[PDB]
Chain A
Amino acid sequence: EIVLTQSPGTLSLSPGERATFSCRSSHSIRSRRVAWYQHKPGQAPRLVIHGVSNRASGISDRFSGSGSGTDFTLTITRVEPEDFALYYCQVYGASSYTFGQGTKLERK
């Protein structure tokens, strides 16, 4: 039913640039309540924002969520090498919700 799409899959970025994220869902979220994750290779997943723009506890000010409707975006001002990981998208918390594809903050 619900299928999430993400772009770009890769990011040719260096420490200090700005990233562009997008989660164009098949549906249109009416309540505008989503979430974003951070999954480092080997470690445990970590919640980025607990809402469409509400950041999670302990998350720095560099991460900031924005968007509405179907343009679920994110931006990372002044990226750091300690954030190079896989990022997933959310839909809602209900009887049916899928997961995003997955971007990658590549050092190259």
Chain B
Amino acid sequence: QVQLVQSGAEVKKPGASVKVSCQASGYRFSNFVIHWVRQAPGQRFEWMGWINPYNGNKEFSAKFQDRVTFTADTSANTAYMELRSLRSADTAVYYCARVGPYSWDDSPQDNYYMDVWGKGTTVIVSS
């Protein structure tokens, strides 16, 4: 079945580079778009961008313009997420999601509603 398994926790110092990874198992990773969202304790979810492993098309939100970069490996069925700078306010639980299948009767963006999620890894800046 379709399942996304993320890596373990990664407690790093502020100013380091956290490398969160995803892993596709029950489908062809080179055909679906992977999303990354952020969840802080008590706050709301927040989109961080997406990567298209098929054609290498990348798009990230304006809030994380020069802070988060996206890289993916097709031959290993894994999606990576690098962080340039850190801050104590970034202590949150990172996720990983997968877009839905495309139908013949809809717009090219009506099928990006994050169907399959992943077991969310957590990062701590100062413990």
A and B: direct contact (Cβ < 8 Å)?
yes
Chain B neighbourhood of A99, CB < 8 A? 37, 44-47
B95 interface contact, C-beta 8 A: yes
In the assembly, what is the distance between CA of A98 and CA of B100, in Å? 18
In the assembly, what is the distance between CA of A88 and CA of B37, in Å? 13
Interface contact A44-B44, CB-CB below 8 Å = no
Which of A11-19, A75-83, A89-97 has 4 or more CB atoms under 8 Å from chain B?
Answer: A89-97
In the assembly, what is the distance between CA of A31 and CA of B37, in Å? 23
Distance in Å: Cβ of A77 to nearest Cβ of chain B: 23
Chain B neighbourhood of A90, CB < 8 A? 113
Known: A35-B113, A93-B110, A95-B59. A45 touches B95 (CB 8 A): yes
Interface residues of B toward A: which range? 20 to 34
Residue among B99, B111, B114 with most chain A CB within 10 A: B114
In the assembly, what is the distance between CA of A90 and CA of B115, in Å? 13
Question: What's the tally of chain A residues with a CB closer than 8 Å to chain B?
Answer: 23
Chain B neighbourhood of A46, CB < 8 A? 117
In the assembly, what is the distance between CA of A31 and CA of B114, in Å? 18
State which residues 21-73 of A face B: CB under 8 Å.
Answer: 31, 33, 35, 44-47, 50-51, 56
State which residues 32-81 of B face A: CB under 8 Å.
Answer: 37, 44-47, 59, 61
**A interface residues, Cβ below 8 angstroms from B:** 31, 33, 35, 44-47, 50-51, 56, 88, 90, 92-102
**B interface residues, Cβ below 8 angstroms from A:** 37, 44-47, 59, 61, 95, 99-100, 107, 109-115, 117-120
